[PDB]
Design an enzyme around this catalytic site. Structure first.
Site, PDB file in Angstrom:
ATOM      1  N   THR A  95       0.795  -1.058   0.224  1.00 12.95           N
ATOM      2  CA  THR A  95       0.121  -0.098  -0.672  1.00 12.95           C
ATOM      3  C   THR A  95       0.761   1.606  -0.231  1.00 12.95           C
ATOM      4  O   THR A  95       1.876   1.766   0.505  1.00 12.95           O
ATOM      5  CB  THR A  95      -0.542   0.194   1.416  1.00 12.95           C
ATOM      6  OG1 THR A  95      -1.992  -0.956   1.001  1.00 12.95           O
ATOM      7  CG2 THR A  95      -1.752   1.021   1.496  1.00 12.95           C
ATOM      8  N   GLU A 111      -4.893   6.646  -1.571  1.00 14.34           N
ATOM      9  CA  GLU A 111      -4.416   4.991  -0.970  1.00 14.34           C
ATOM     10  C   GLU A 111      -4.310   4.252  -1.888  1.00 14.34           C
ATOM     11  O   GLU A 111      -5.341   3.887  -2.532  1.00 14.34           O
ATOM     12  CB  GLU A 111      -4.981   4.665   0.312  1.00 14.34           C
ATOM     13  CG  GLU A 111      -4.312   4.351   1.236  1.00 14.34           C
ATOM     14  CD  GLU A 111      -5.318   2.646   1.851  1.00 14.34           C
ATOM     15  OE1 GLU A 111      -5.000   2.233   3.028  1.00 14.34           O
ATOM     16  OE2 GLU A 111      -6.111   3.840   2.246  1.00 14.34           O
TER      17      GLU A 111
END
Length: 142
Positions: A36, A76
């Site tokens: 991520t 994100e």
């Protein structure tokens, strides 16, 4: 739904942008097999101007390699890969191809993680189409 987005990638898609990864790739998401990256606010304000918050899907490039991904919009990016690759560079190129769903009310850590795995499954299905898969070789990823 098992699949999302129209047959072809058309306005508002695709949305191309390059941004810096802030705070690196955390160990937690890495342990979950979901690399991520949080993109810096700058470089996305103009490109995402009229877009609704929520989860998007498309492709992202890091360390000269392209991976399918889902992105929560702040942005994100969750890269989709199952080999446990070593991600560390600070610059990422993203190409948003479609929308998955709006944000959901927080219902705990495990629910959050399970929704991400579901979004990933749906993204993979949604990008199986020719209009979508061709962007893996987009000139922007040169």
């Amino acid at each position: 739904p098992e699949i999302v987005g129209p047959e072809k990638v058309q306005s508002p898609y695709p949305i191309r942008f390059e941004g810096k990864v802030v705070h690196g790739f955390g160990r937690g998401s890495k342990e979950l097999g979901i690399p991520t990256a949080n993109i810096s606010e700058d470089a996305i304000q103009e490109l995402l101007r009229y877009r609704d918050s929520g989860v998007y899907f498309g492709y992202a490039m890091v360390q000269k390699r392209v991976f399918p991904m889902v992105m929560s919009v702040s942005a994100e990016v969750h890269l989709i890969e199952r080999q446990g690759e070593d991600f560390y560079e600070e610059i990422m190129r993203v190409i948003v191809l479609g929308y998955i769903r709006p944000e959901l009310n927080y219902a705990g850590l495990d629910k959050l993680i399970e929704d991400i795995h579901t979004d990933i499954r749906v993204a993979l299905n949604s990008m199986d189409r020719p209009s979508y898969s061709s962007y893996k070789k987009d000139p922007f990823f040169k």
